[PDB]
Design a protein around this ligand. Structure first.
Ligand SMILES: COC(=O)Cn1nnnc1C1CCCC1
Lengths: 237, 300
């Protein structure tokens, strides 16, 4: 059924699973028109499809041309996400196909269920976790590939860099969610924390800086302080 | 006019005949029902006074044979049987008719209610939903499950309604997932009408039969089928205009006949609010919308 804090270790077992987040599929800017009405302009988006055990991220870039001449774009975006996830599953060898797909928003359940009717043994599930995957576009190398795309494209990343050499997937996912939550809450301060020290830099083939074990502890503490600092700013605590 | 005689009435029972009902006392001199209108299917149904468990009954058409009811003390119910000796049957009916031991089917001449509820219902189609080929009449009860209910358990005692499942490969063409899920016209017109039912009269007959089994027996699977068949039409953008007009008439008479005190268990709020106020056909069921708003505004 739904995925919550009681079955959280299930994310790191040996049953292949993918999270699907559709927040960033249909993105727009809102602006006034010459006549004083309001218009939207779409910008490139992306589907965030992540294996939480391995860190493999299938980033399908959604080019603005897919919306051309279409109506009800917010609805279409869910069905387009489901179509693309279905296509991804069919493209994977059988032994790589997920046994479960967990959608971050309940509105993705029916579109994905309908697109996956041919896969009755893949469970489509919601989650009670509030996961900050919308902040994926705060990761500079991900945002750059999305905004530069001139056509639909799929790009593969490992969102954990090389962390699994040193830590478990439970800890790596916890680190990711903390980083993404901080980037979502105060992007400028999070990037400052992540980039202030110039002696520690991101490898060409990585998304995050090359922190030692001790430095990750320091960074994680600074991210938790940021989140708490912003909570206090928000609620006047 | 035709007659369903009773050998006797050994146990106290509420007897239904179509939309009518009456009580018979234990061992009362009751010998059946006369003046049954020829030209329609009928249902004769039972609820025992000492055990309201299992409503049960029989669908029949007096044009197909001479049927009578006799209580079986071993299986503990009133059973319909067919009398093959026509002369014996005529003689027994005449005797009971002369002794005034039959109730008269109490049809008001102005009243088209039963025709309006059974316009599309045919015995031959009933006998394919309810499979007991050795009898010309069909037994239904409160507890019988549907083929679809059994897939989600004795198959011989099941209601074989046409399975409707909005999230099934039958309902959704590969490549048309969004289209077919948000607009059920393919599933209604190609799969169901052209493919399975052949015409709208057969679809409406099954819809009407499901409603009647829900109302007269409290059969839960029948109520599910009734609502599914309504939702399938209302959720289709493309429906022949004659079908929408006829559906409005069908549903109006069903809502009109429904016992007010059973509305909470016979009407699905989600389906009705969706069909009347959100669906493609939300403006195509004027008569049904008006009776629903005036009789059951709480459901909405
Ligand atoms: C052979 O069984 C019977 O004869 C039963 N019976 N007894 N009295 N009436 C009947 C029914 C038989 C046909 C009409 C009513």
């Amino acid at each position: 059924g739904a995925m919550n804090s009681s079955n959280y270790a299930e994310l790191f077992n040996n049953d292949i699973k993918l999270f699907v987040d559709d927040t960033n599929v249909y993105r727009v800017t809102v602006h006034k028109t010459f006549e004083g009405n309001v218009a939207t302009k779409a910008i490139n988006g992306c589907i965030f499809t992540l294996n939480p055990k391995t860190g493999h991220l299938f980033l399908k870039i959604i080019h603005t041309s897919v919306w051309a001449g279409q109506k009800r774009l917010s609805q279409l975006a869910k069905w387009k996400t489901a179509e693309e996830v279905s296509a991804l599953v069919r493209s994977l060898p059988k032994e790589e196909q997920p046994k479960q797909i967990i959608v971050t928003r309940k509105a993705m359940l029916d579109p994905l269920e309908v697109h996956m009717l041919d896969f009755p043994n893949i469970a489509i599930r919601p989650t009670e976790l509030r996961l900050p995957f919308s902040a994926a576009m705060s990761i500079d190398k991900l945002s750059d590939v999305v905004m530069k795309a001139t056509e639909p494209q799929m790009v593969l990343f490992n969102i954990y860099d090389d962390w699994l050499d040193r830590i478990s997937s439970y800890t790596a996912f916890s680190r990711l969610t903390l980083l993404l939550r901080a980037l979502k809450t105060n992007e400028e301060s999070a990037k400052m924390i992540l980039l202030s020290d110039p002696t520690i830099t991101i490898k060409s083939y990585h998304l995050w800086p090359s922190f030692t074990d001790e430095q990750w502890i320091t960074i994680e503490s600074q991210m938790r302080d940021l989140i708490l600092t912003e909570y206090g700013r928000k609620y006047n605590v | 006019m035709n007659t369903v005689p009773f050998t006797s009435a050994p146990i106290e029972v509420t007897i239904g005949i179509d939309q009518y009902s009456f009580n018979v006392k234990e061992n009362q001199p009751f010998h059946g029902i006369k003046d049954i209108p020829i030209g329609h299917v009928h249902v004769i149904h039972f609820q025992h006074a000492d055990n309201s468990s299992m409503r049960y009954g029989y669908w029949f058409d007096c044009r197909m044979g001479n049927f009578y009811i006799q209580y079986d003390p071993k299986d503990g119910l009133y059973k319909m049987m067919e009398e093959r000796d026509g002369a014996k049957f005529e003689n027994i009916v005449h005797n009971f008719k002369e002794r005034q031991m039959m109730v008269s089917y109490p049809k008001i001449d102005e009243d088209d209610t039963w025709y309006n509820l059974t316009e599309f219902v045919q015995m031959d189609k009933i006998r394919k939903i309810v499979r007991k080929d050795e009898n010309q009449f069909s037994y239904v009860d409160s507890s019988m499950t549907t083929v679809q209910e059994n897939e989600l358990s004795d198959p011989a005692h099941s209601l074989n309604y046409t399975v409707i499942n909005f999230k099934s490969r039958e309902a959704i063409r590969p490549g048309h997932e969004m289209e077919d899920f948000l607009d059920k016209s393919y599933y209604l017109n190609t799969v169901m009408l052209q493919g399975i039912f052949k015409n709208s009269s057969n679809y409406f007959g099954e819809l009407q039969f499901a409603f009647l089994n829900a109302m007269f027996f409290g059969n839960y699977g029948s109520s599910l089928q009734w609502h599914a068949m309504i939702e399938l039409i209302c959720s289709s953008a493309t429906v022949p205009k004659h079908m929408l007009d006829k559906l409005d008439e069908i549903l109006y008479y069903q809502i009109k006949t429904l016992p007010e005190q059973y509305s909470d268990i016979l009407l699905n709020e989600r389906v009705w609010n969706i069909c009347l106020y959100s669906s493609f056909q939300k403006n195509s069921l004027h008569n049904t919308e008006k009776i629903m708003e005036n009789k059951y505004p709480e459901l909405l």
